[PDB]
Symmetry: C5
Subunit: 206 residues, 5 copies
């Protein structure tokens, strides 16, 4: 386990080879999850990019968080998609927490600790446990077929994942930096492999 606390991955070039792959010894399929992360990039006015990409052998977009140019955050689970529109994008590091629940299909999207409206997606689905998690790229297969025009450029960090929906009060503790214990994927204890041109640096965000 590597403690990545206060560190961030830097993807400083547009490329299809640069990525990191994050391990998840997860034994059971996800009836719900939350994923939170920090990212920073100036691509938001140039083009879309993959922020977080979870894939399984049956489904290359099993969870994906994706900025889509001139729209906002695409959030898609099980290959079906919703949009959270962002009409005035800004150049700053941004903290997103997203969460999804099978029992109701409710999606929550939180940006910088402010909630977006709850939306419905994939009620009754179940996210596969045998999955490849990739940062820095969008993957179109179980572990590859990355597209250079979908790569992230800039920084990502504080990637945390839970197998349950965090309440609003928990998400405030995340954003404000209280203590917490992610039970699927944990930045304090991350297991990962780095590929290509990717660096670990001090985080820019406070």
């Amino acid at each position: 386990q590597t403690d990545m606390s206060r560190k961030a991955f830097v993807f400083p070039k547009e490329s299809d080879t640069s990525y990191v792959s994050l391990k998840a010894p997860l034994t059971k399929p996800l009836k719900a999850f939350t994923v939170c992360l920090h990212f920073y990039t100036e691509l938001s006015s140039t083009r879309g990019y993959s922020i977080f990409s979870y894939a399984t052998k049956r489904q290359d977009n099993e969870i994906l968080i994706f900025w889509s140019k001139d729209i906002g955050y695409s959030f898609t689970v099980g290959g079906s998609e919703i949009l959270f529109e962002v009409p005035e994008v800004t150049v700053a590091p941004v903290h997103i927490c997203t969460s999804w629940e099978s029992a109701s299909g409710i999606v929550e999207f939180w940006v910088d600790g402010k909630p977006r409206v709850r939306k419905s997606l994939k009620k009754g689905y179940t996210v596969g446990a045998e999955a490849s998690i990739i940062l820095g790229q969008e993957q179109d297969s179980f572990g590859g077929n990355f597209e250079g025009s979908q790569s992230l450029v800039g920084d990502i960090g504080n990637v945390n994942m839970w197998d349950f929906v965090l309440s609003p009060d928990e998400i405030n503790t995340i954003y404000l930096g209280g203590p917490f214990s992610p039970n699927v994927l944990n930045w304090r204890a991350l297991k990962y492999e780095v590929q290509g041109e990717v660096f670990t640096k001090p985080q820019l965000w406070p």
Copy 2:
């Protein structure tokens, strides 16, 4: 019996079918009232929607608070309508209180604790006590004929109603959240029943 403190109803998809019916003990006709409720929806740019629909067997729009696209809050009692202009709208949860008084016809409308100018409406009218209070839908008959295009999407909560006009000091306490106790419809002691795609979830607003 249910105490909904810190919980909100979620209507996560547009339909003609998802709604909740709220029950009131009142049998004395309302010579005045206040209703306060907190809600969050992104429909405000796309289309109109019904925030709070109060029908009586005589009259489908006995009280209604409604958002009209590019107009602002429509408010109506006894089927007669006034408009509160909202020249620009922002995506965030919004708390409104509205109160009406037959003896003067004055309507007050309050948005996030800031008052709109008082207006006259239906002086001398009297709202019927036999009531079908419905959230999430607009009703065009007593408890039915919902127009799906008028449905709410998103969250509603803290629905409280009083048989009298709250003073400005009380209304500030409602918004900032101090102690109070309504006598027509109390969120902390809410008789309700639920139909269709409706969920009770932790409230997104502090």
Copy 3:
């Protein structure tokens, strides 16, 4: 005498008949005066209205503070006018103070405690003491012939008047609502008569 503290007059309808008449104990003519008041109205985008009309047998516009559509605050003394043009207006309660001094003709106009530039009006004039003071209407006879399109809609209150020019420091404490004592017209010791649709209600402002 009525202490109108915390209370305001509400004019909830257009009419040529809703008004209040304020009685001044005023024997000697005014070589100088100050008037301060709160009002709140949505007419500002739509048409002009009379904030404060002071009339005499010789002159129906002996003092008049008047909003002029797409122009701003007209202030007239003795029927001569100057304009404090406002480039754009916002819907919130407004506090104004106006002072005038015959011995110099200098007018000061204050809005929310911010001074507008001093101007000259009717140097050496003398305002009559035997006056009809009307709130809610503009008058063109001594006490009547109101014009409906000039009537106020919404609220007025904290109407105070002094037979001398307040300094900048006093006018600040008027806006802050500190200790002061008017001597021509006092909201805590008001003598008035109400005609038509007018109501006394809690004030909508701090």
Copy 4:
């Protein structure tokens, strides 16, 4: 000598006859100087005006601070001139300090305690002390040839002048109203001759 503290001159109408003449005790030519003042006017919407004027038998614009419409502050020494352009202006009192040094020609212009870029002007020149200082008018002969379209309207005060360049730290104590002691022209011990319709009134700026 008169202590004008807390007081300001008021020019309440446009004319070419109202002005006030300030007497400097100075006898030795100025190789450097600073002047600071508060003024307030609405004319910036409409026309240029002479804020501070200094003239000599040989030169009518020996120092002149002048608002040039659609441009900003003109500053001129010895009849040559530079602009500190101002793209956005607002109706409020404004405090300016300007300072000049023959040994470099560097001008500093400070507006509301926030500095403008240093610009060179009349390097090596020398300013005549046998001078008439005028507020309210531009000045085209030693004491006269005023131009009505260049008169100031509104208020002027805190006129202070030093025969040396104040440091940046000193100028902050001016703007924040701390202690200082001018030696060419001192608002706390002023000599002046008021002429025409000019009034001394309590200042509007804090």
Copy 5:
């Protein structure tokens, strides 16, 4: 050497002759650096200018920080350039810190203590120690061939340089004016040569 603290160099007119040379005590080639500085100029809307020019006998733009009109900051190493574009610019002093690392090519740019996204430049390059460092001008030969169009006008100071990439925390204390000690170029201990119309004055920025 001189302690220049609280003082800045003023370049008050455009020329191809006014410049200062800073004598780095530098002997071993730089595999990384940080340079921080304050500058203030109104040229940013009119034309580009050289903020900090480092050259070696082989290479006239060995490190160059430059403003490109309607583009933003150009940062170049070894003659290769990246843009940190700026869509809106304001007339105020600006503090920049910039860093580069040979081992990765990661460039950081910090404007007023806000980080720009990290970008890749000149991986594996090395920066020569035998160098001419010049402010006020761009240099196209080792110590000369200045272009008037590329001269700085206005003020520059607090120039500090390190032979290593400062962390985000260390860069914050620089912006906040906490204690630090540069090891390549130090404003507390500057060695420099001055040519032409350049002056040392008290700094305008806080």
